[PDB]
Amino acid sequence: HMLSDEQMQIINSLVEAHHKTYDDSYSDFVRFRPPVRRLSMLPHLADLVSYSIQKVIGFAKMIPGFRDLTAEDQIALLKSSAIEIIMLRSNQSFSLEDMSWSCGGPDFKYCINDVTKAGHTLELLEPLVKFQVGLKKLKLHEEEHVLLMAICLLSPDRPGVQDHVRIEALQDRLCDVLQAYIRIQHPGGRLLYAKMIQKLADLRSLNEEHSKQYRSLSFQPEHSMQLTPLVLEVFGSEV
Amino acid sequence: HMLSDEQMQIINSLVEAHHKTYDDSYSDFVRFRPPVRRLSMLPHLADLVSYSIQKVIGFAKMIPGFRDLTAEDQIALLKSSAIEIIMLRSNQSFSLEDMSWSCGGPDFKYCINDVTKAGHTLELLEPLVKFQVGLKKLKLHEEEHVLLMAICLLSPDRPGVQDHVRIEALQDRLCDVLQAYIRIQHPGGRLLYAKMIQKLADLRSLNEEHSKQYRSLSFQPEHSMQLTPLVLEVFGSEV
């Protein structure tokens, strides 16, 4: 059995979309407020997260079917999944060696420690690293990693979503491609698909935990003033 | 004739306040999003203006009499005069030689050109330089420069001000010190005082012009997203 001309074209678009929105050299990071090791890392990570939102948005607009949803549903989907897509795409810079995100020399090597100088506790940063390690081990192909991001972004179960039947349909078609692709092109991945869907569940927990921490942060103006307009909007609840 | 123990203590506080909020080495500028020469200079100047707002606020809180006004009046005064105080304090880094603000090596040397890569036109940047040149020539003492900033910040004629009689009184006392100081300690400054008050008028024009340019900028989200929470609040009209 094999993939259809349809599923194949979906993959082409997603992989191209990703390449178009993710620089493996992280050259743009020099434009962020420099890191510093009262939350000395907040200005840098805020800029990093903000830069990522923009990237996740560019990627989403190229997810086939997404541009056709209502503006409102597009926003509802982006708002609730943004933090998860960031965690997923960051796997690409996560090194199991140093248990950190290597995005450059010393300055752009993000260690668990740094995120703490940004308003987050270690008891909560632990599941994140645990997630990154598990995800890294799945040794996903670019096609599976790019599909996993689209699947996550099209979850019908997000607050604020309207046409949850149409989002439901789009996601299923994507889940099919991932399932078919894994079977056809992935030697040894008979149980991979089920592992990937389990990552979606973990992201939910990580998402909920981030909301709580971010909430505290956003109620303190001395801190929220350090965020960027876009982060305040995506993570804000003015929805 | 001479200054009173009162006027003298006002001066001590203002000069100290200024020293406490203005670094002549501009060492903090390395924490701003780096300059770049669609408005490539906006992220840097936004951070510069934002950093300055915070400084102007710290200076204001030490202006004797100011901390006693209502929170609302303090905000009304800061909102409407912030841009003017920035223009005044920046005289300290303005070099008549290169007609620019020298705040560092090549990267932090602000030329008329750069401000254009930030949303502003040259036909409007012209009065600014003209103002900086005139102000520089007045060769003010630190006591006169610091007084001029306090006088400007306590102008009763600002939209949103409530107790314009109390702000009126505070400013007069400050205008008296400046007048007395110039007479007692400033050789050759018989007409200086009148020149300084004329600078206040010019700042009004510059302020009004900035509002118009900033307004256009703030209605375009692709651009306003580049500003900082504090700039959006101080220059915003949600007042």
Binding site: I57, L78, P229, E233, V234, V239 | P221, S224, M225
Partner: peptide, 10 residues
């Protein structure tokens, strides 16, 4: 109002 998001979404 999500001004930024609407804008970035074209």
């Amino acid at each position: 109002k999500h001004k930024i998001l609407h804008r970035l979404l074209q």
